């Protein structure tokens, strides 16, 4: 036997990672000294990748009915949504997956008196200037391997205009009131990278941040005294669209184990 | 046999980072009107690094806080009682070298409740007063001035074994304009540990970073009740007077750290 | 004195051994070679012939990859490669009038051709994380001298000739992905057959028997 000895500068590297989504807003309602060295010196490098990206997101909602005759309501609000798809980068296809949540929500209500059969809506949520629209991007692209130790990231994403649909409430007797309209402009403000450490393993997620400014088509509430409010409701946000689309390029810089040329058994070559 | 070895190397280091608090879940309420090509480049040359684990002894101090808002007409109608994040600053002695720290507490997974004493313009209407019971998590963010927290960027594994603390509630008087006014008292929760989490933010200016020490709750005694109303003996924590007139609750333990630090 | 000199066709296939350790699924302790056997029928001179063969190696180079000592890290203590400081042995028995007159021999030699052995992919199984994969490798065999030996893979012992070979590496390079290593030359033991039942060799041999 012959044994190739190992080199002095040991190999070390990243720990296992399975990408996923970050922490997500939630809610629920009810009705009545020392140091030690693990591995010796190792070798590393810095790089700057550049690539094209396309993202697709769906909003989703939940409506529940207030226990009673049926003219009352309990809550209409946003819900985490997920999507899966595939698209071709200049080189080849890539499969991706997206999770959309929301925060900075605003809430409203209508209370047309109190009679057994009256129309009431206790919480209907809307998006406005004080709001953000997070998005998470877990991918199979070759680049995402070297995105654990990241110095910097940035993006040049352009704008998009989300528009609202129409909802019709299910009253037992009388004209059905409806909620239609609304739209908000989404723009980019930053990015966030999160890691969750469990049992010498890491679960991580990369998510974009957005800031939102208002648009012309106002959503409105029929059969009531609401004053032409701006903002996006949650009843029919996606509006009969399979999805929205955004694209751009993100420049990433990260430490990478250097696949350096020097260490190899002496004489590794085709013979002569 | 034997293998090859390299010559002189470059000097590389961390990028400047400043500690900051975590992004926090929030909601705001509104009162009604009346009653190209694909390419790569190399920025820097080969460098030197290593993996040295650290171990530290921690004591974290936290505090809750709340909001209360009342609507305009004739009183008797409280719209919102809710939690809110808070901040604290302290110096704790470790191995003979004082370390300043800052802490920020937030909550998630809340449960809501309500009580409509009646529909007349004179009655006790409470819309939202929150609680936490087996379906809620309490998040804590923690900074420092010490060395360990200087090199906590680029982490390989971070774990900790902290102890539990039981928290109780206080009482808030719903002092109306008229009549014998009612009272809310009670509160009991146990704080256990779950994972740690690192959270980084990128932008044109300097980057920000913050930790989140997750905790999980298990409900315990004593129960809580609202006097002068029918809801009774529910089990959990309210948000009117969470800290029983105490400036701080404490935790202790030891946390192990690993990171890539230059040679 | 009597003379025999007939044509021949040889077939063979390597075999590999893999052993796991640690109980977590991330660490492997050895990936090596072992002897194997093959059996076949061919028709050289208008007459059928049946046969048995074994393949072996000596002079194996041993490489290693010790990543982190932490419990979750990819460790493969030793895996073998057959670079130039090596040799190969083969043994051939057949059913024919020859090989009943092989013993008590005087002279023996051969004029065989050459072949090309290539590597194949091996997919590790980690519980979580991307899957490291070992792929590639190249080596070619060249003739050398022959001498008698006994292939006892069957219950009965046989009398058989042993053909030795010398090795020379070639272009396709073997690499372990998801690690620092790349562009190493040789032939691993992880998957040498490459989806082929067997390689093939041809030629003739001359023996003088008594």
Automatic annotation (TrEMBL), chain A:
One biological process term in Gene Ontology: symbiont entry into host cell via permeabilization of host membrane
GO CC aspect terms: viral outer capsid
Chief location: virion
Annotated compartments: Virion
Keyword vocabulary terms for this entry: Capsid protein, Coiled coil, Hemagglutinin, Host cell membrane, Host cytoplasm, Host cytoskeleton, Host endoplasmic reticulum, Host membrane, Host-virus interaction, Membrane, Outer capsid protein, Viral attachment to host cell, Viral penetration into host cytoplasm, Viral penetration via permeabilization of host membrane, Virion, Virus entry into host cell
Top-level taxon in the UniProt lineage: Viruses
Family statement: Belongs to the rotavirus VP4 family.
Protein name: Outer capsid protein VP4
TrEMBL record, chain B:
Domain Rotavirus VP4 membrane interaction as annotated: residue spans: 37-261
Signal peptide feature range: none
Subcellular compartments: Virion
Source organism superkingdom: Viruses
UniProt record similarity statement: Belongs to the rotavirus VP4 family.
Protein name: Outer capsid protein VP4
Organism lineage: Viruses, Riboviria, Orthornavirae, Duplornaviricota, Resentoviricetes
Protein encoded by which gene: VP4
Residues of the full protein shown: 35 to 479 of 779
From TrEMBL, chain C:
Recorded family membership: Belongs to the rotavirus VP4 family.
Gene behind the chain: VP4
Annotated ranges, domain Rotavirus VP4 membrane interaction: 1-210
Subcellular location: Virion
Protein name stated in the entry: Outer capsid protein VP4
Taxonomic classification: Viruses, Riboviria, Orthornavirae, Duplornaviricota, Resentoviricetes
Transmembrane segments: none
Full-protein interval shown: 267 to 476 of 779
Species in which this protein is naturally found: Rotavirus A
